[PDB]
Design a protein around this ligand. Structure first.
Ligand SMILES: [Mg+2]
Ligand SMILES: [Mg+2]
Ligand SMILES: [Mg+2]
Ligand SMILES: [Mg+2]
Ligand SMILES: [Mg+2]
Ligand SMILES: [Mg+2]
Ligand SMILES: [Mg+2]
Ligand code: NI
Ligand code: NI
Ligand code: NI
Ligand code: NI
Length: 195
C-alpha cells in the first residue's frame, strides 16, 4: 500500500516531467552548458575509466563529452541493456565514430548487438565515474529513472568489484530539477544543471 503510494507519486512526477521535456535548439543550448561544466569538473578530469550514456531526445546530449573522453585518453564504456529484465552491462567502445555503426534498440539508441563480443567494465577493474541518466533529479541527488531500475542494480554490482564506489554524476536540464523526488533506492553524488 505504502509501496503503491510511492509508485503512484513517481508515475505522476514522470508524467509531469515528460510533459516539460522544449525546443531542439534549447536542448542543444543546455547540453553545451553542461559539457563545459563537465569538462571543467574535477572528478571528470581525474577519471580514468568512464561510463557514459548515448542521449535520447529528452536527455542532455552527451556527444561533445564523448569526443572529449577520447581526447583525454579515458577508457570509455556505454550501456548495453537486456530488455527482458533489469540487467545492463557497460561495454567498451574504442572511438566516437564506432557509435555510428552500431545497431540500435527499440529506443533508437545505439548499443552493440547480441553476437558482438565486448569488454565489460566489471571484467577489467570497474569504473571511476558513471554519468547517470534519468527523468528527474532533486538537489539531494535523488533520481527518478524511467521505472526499470537498471542503474540502481548496476551500481550494486559495482560495489562487488571496487573498494571505492564509482563517482556518479547526473546531467540534467533545468526542467528536470524537482523539489522532492519520491524514493524507496540509490542517490547520485552530484546533479549538474543550469541555463
Ligand atoms: Mg529541454
Ligand atoms: Mg537532446
Ligand atoms: Mg536485449
Ligand atoms: Mg546488472
Ligand atoms: Mg545503425
Ligand atoms: Mg550479453
Ligand atoms: Mg517539483
Ligand atoms: Ni559491466
Ligand atoms: Ni550481462
Ligand atoms: Ni535505470
Ligand atoms: Ni528537500
Amino acid at each position: 500500500m505504502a509501496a503503491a503510494a510511492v509508485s503512484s507519486a513517481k508515475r505522476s512526477l514522470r508524467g509531469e516531467l515528460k510533459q516539460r521535456l522544449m525546443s531542439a535548439e534549447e536542448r542543444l543550448r543546455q547540453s553545451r552548458v553542461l559539457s563545459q561544466k563537465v569538462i571543467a569538473h574535477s572528478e571528470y578530469q581525474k577519471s580514468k575509466r568512464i561510463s557514459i550514456f548515448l542521449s535520447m531526445q529528452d536527455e542532455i546530449e552527451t556527444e561533445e563529452i564523448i569526443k572529449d573522453i577520447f581526447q583525454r585518453g579515458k577508457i570509455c564504456f556505454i550501456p548495453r541493456y537486456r530488455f527482458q529484465s533489469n540487467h545492463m552491462d557497460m561495454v567498451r567502445i574504442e572511438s566516437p565514430e564506432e557509435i555510428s555503426l552500431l545497431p540500435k534498440t527499440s529506443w533508437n539508441i545505439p548499443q552493440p548487438g547480441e553476437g558482438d563480443v565486448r569488454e565489460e567494465a566489471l571484467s577489467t577493474g570497474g569504473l571511476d565515474l558513471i554519468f547517470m541518466p534519468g527523468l528527474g533529479f532533486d538537489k539531494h541527488g535523488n533520481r527518478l529513472g524511467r521505472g526499470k531500475g537498471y542503474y540502481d542494480a548496476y551500481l550494486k554490482r559495482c560495489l562487488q568489484h571496487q573498494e571505492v564506489k564509482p563517482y556518479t554524476l547526473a546531467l540534467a536540464f533545468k526542467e528536470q530539477i524537482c523539489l522532492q523526488v519520491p524514493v524507496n533506492d540509490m542517490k547520485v553524488d552530484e546533479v549538474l544543471y543550469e541555463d
